[PDB]
């Protein structure tokens, strides 16, 4: 299941390694209260979040500027730590709020693109890691950034907009503005447990949110049918605050990665197949081994199909596994010592 990690500056300095948190008491045991990322951590837990990680680049007081934050995110040690820690799945950086939107110049537009690229670089340390991204406050700059973003890792990026205000208050009575990334991350964990990975985390109610920091009408231009669209957090008349949108940063309309559930479902299938395949690393490459691998894979895929995870009326259209001296490889492949398994899938559409 998706286990998010929080990257940000923390008032209490700690080592360069992450920590494991299962409840706010453990968070209080390691960290002091009051702070932007602590408030979001509370928001994540209060929405239904079970467990998450926290990583600190430094202390809260050493915030300098946007370029300093991006440069700090580009250090090598963070990539190794998330790569080493196996169960991390999502990346969250709520500290982007603390910086003002002075102008809409090319200087600001490029900086937002680098933050997206830098986070996506961190997501490529291991396969299956999804990144949750933020967008500039006004729709004009966000639309400019969406159209002008050029990267081959658009498949792994999900962006939410706009910022959110919650009932939490500082010593001064001002509503705390929080990024929606923390809120959705709890929803994914709830959706992963109650409904599973293959259920889209959209059309679902959030909690303890007063109102989006901006309105509905200004957000019409951000959504786009073909590609480079956003996901909207939108208030409703008589239905509460809702999450409206489940599309990633993928551009091509035909790609199956245009939805967050499809990309995560395939990666979830990939993780088990790698786990299952490790038991066969040096097995003899004959008919007995192929039948054993086919049986285990077919049974697990059949189990997933009966939960509605795959699009199909019979088994054949749902999935297909090929493994043998034919239809998957040749005799020269056996002498080379490699086994080839071909798996076909049919994902759902939200």
């Amino acid at each position: 299941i998706g286990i998010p990690v929080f990257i940000g500056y923390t008032s209490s300095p700690v080592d360069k390694t992450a920590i494991k948190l299962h409840s706010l008491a453990d968070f209080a045991r390691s960290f002091p209260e009051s702070g932007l990322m602590y408030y979001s951590v509370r928001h994540f837990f209060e929405n239904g979040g079970q467990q998450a990680y926290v990583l600190s680049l430094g202390t809260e007081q050493q915030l300098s500027d946007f370029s300093s934050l991006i440069t700090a995110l580009q250090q090598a040690w963070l990539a190794q730590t998330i790569a080493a820690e196996n169960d991390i799945t999502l990346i969250i950086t709520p500290d982007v709020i603390r910086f003002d939107q002075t102008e809409i110049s090319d200087t600001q537009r490029d900086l937002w693109l680098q933050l997206w690229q830098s986070v996506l670089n961190l997501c490529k340390s291991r396969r299956g890691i999804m990144g949750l991204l933020d967008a500039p406050d006004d729709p004009t700059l966000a639309a400019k950034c969406l159209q002008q973003f050029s990267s081959a890792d658009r498949q792994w990026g999900v962006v939410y907009w706009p910022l959110l205000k919650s009932a939490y208050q500082d010593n001064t009575q001002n509503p705390i503005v929080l990024s929606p990334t923390a809120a959705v991350a709890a929803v994914i964990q709830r959706n992963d447990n109650q409904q599973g990975v293959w259920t889209a985390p959209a059309n679902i109610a959030l909690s303890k949110v007063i109102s989006p920091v901006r309105a509905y009408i200004e957000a019409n231009a951000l959504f786009n049918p073909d590609g480079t669209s956003l996901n909207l957090v939108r208030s409703f008349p008589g239905k509460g605050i809702r999450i409206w949108g489940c599309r990633t940063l993928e551009n091509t309309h035909d790609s199956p990665w245009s939805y967050i559930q499809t990309r995560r479902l395939v990666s979830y299938i990939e993780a088990y197949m790698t786990q299952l395949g490790r038991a066969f690393v040096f097995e003899p490459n004959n008919a007995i081994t192929w039948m054993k691998f086919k049986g285990q894979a077919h049974n697990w895929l059949r189990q997933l199909w009966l939960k509605g995870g795959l699009r199909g009326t019979q088994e054949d259209q749902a999935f297909e596994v090929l493994l043998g001296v034919d239809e998957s490889m040749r005799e020269a492949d056996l002498r080379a010592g490699k086994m080839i398994i071909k798996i076909r899938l049919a994902v759902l559409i939200p």
């Binding site: 309309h253 035909d254 790609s255 990939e270 790698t274 395949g277 490790r278 690393v281 040096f282």
Partner: peptide, 14 residues
């Protein structure tokens, strides 16, 4: 020695 992961990259056109 290990397990390798491949994904189909042939173009899908519509």
């Amino acid at each position: 020695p290990g397990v390798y992961i491949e994904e189909d990259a042939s173009l899908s056109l519509s």
